[PDB]
Amino acid sequence: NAVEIISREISPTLDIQTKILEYMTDFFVKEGFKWLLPVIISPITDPLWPDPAGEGMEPAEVEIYGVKMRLTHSMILHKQLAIAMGLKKIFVLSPNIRLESRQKDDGRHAYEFTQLDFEVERAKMEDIMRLIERLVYGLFRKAEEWTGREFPKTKRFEVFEYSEVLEEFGSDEKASQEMEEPFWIINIPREFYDREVDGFWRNYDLILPYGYGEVASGGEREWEYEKIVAKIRKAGLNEDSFRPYLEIAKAGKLKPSAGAGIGVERLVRFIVGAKHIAEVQPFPRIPGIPAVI
Ligand code: NA
Known about the structure:
The chain has helices at residues 2-6, 11-30, 76-84, 125-147, 162-168, 172-178, 225-234, 243-250, 264-272, and strands at 34-36, 41-42, 61-64, 67-71, 89-97, 112-121, 158-161, 183-186, 196-197, 200-201, 203-208, 213-220, 257-263. The protein has 293 residues and is α+β, with helices and mostly antiparallel strands. It has a single domain (1-293), classed as Bira Bifunctional Protein, Domain 2 (BirA Bifunctional Protein, domain 2, 2-Layer Sandwich), CATH 3.30.930.10. The strands form three sheets. The protein has an eight-stranded mixed sheet with strand order 1-5-6-13-12-11-8-7, sandwiched between helices. Strands 2-4-3 form a three-stranded antiparallel sheet, with no helix packed on it. Strands 9-10 form a two-stranded antiparallel ribbon. β3 (61-64) and β4 (67-71) form a beta hairpin. The longest helix is centred in the middle third of the chain and has 23 residues, at 125-147. It is classed as structural genomics, unknown function.
């Protein structure tokens, strides 16, 4: 009900969201990153496949001036293109639209959400993981002041291989339920753009404790045409749906980089202790339920 949605009290949560957005955007600007504006419709987007976290659905699509456009799954390809433009360090507050099923309505997913999405030329996985640890520690100390509650105190998070998480816990979420500090999961076989080297994937997810689940994901990247297109073909994806990106790769303009996206609503939910992510959204976007507003 529309009247019901707008009769919720959410002012304290949005006051916290404002403090989080100010803190994070200020951090990246002061670190020397360029602040880019988002892409919403494009011929190319993140396939989100293969990916253990994904259902592999098609993006929303619309015809624009007679040409098929995809609503942004994520800006990953565009981040790589920004690095190809010589911009070195970039971030964006990026809307993502992912039409996941009701099976992903588990309290941490929304079908429309925002990532603070960033990328750094020539960075390695340890560089990005340490940068996120520095950001998160400082944020959690401020959150203690804002809320009057205690937050996790560790500064270097434990690291698990994805294969070990499957063996010990069964899933990323079961691991989250059993942990009291944030932790990393690394080496996850997934999309063509994440860098793979002789069976090892140079990638990482940050997982929150107390069952709150994933909050950030990233990797080092592939930049070579021959490697990228081999991965696309092996996965059975449509090469033509990546054509301009592949033209740029073939021309040699992609560079080595690494980065991550941080789910803003997920982070707000953690800091305020909300059971469901819909509680932190003025206009909920619940997987499998088309919003009335
Ligand atoms: Na290989």
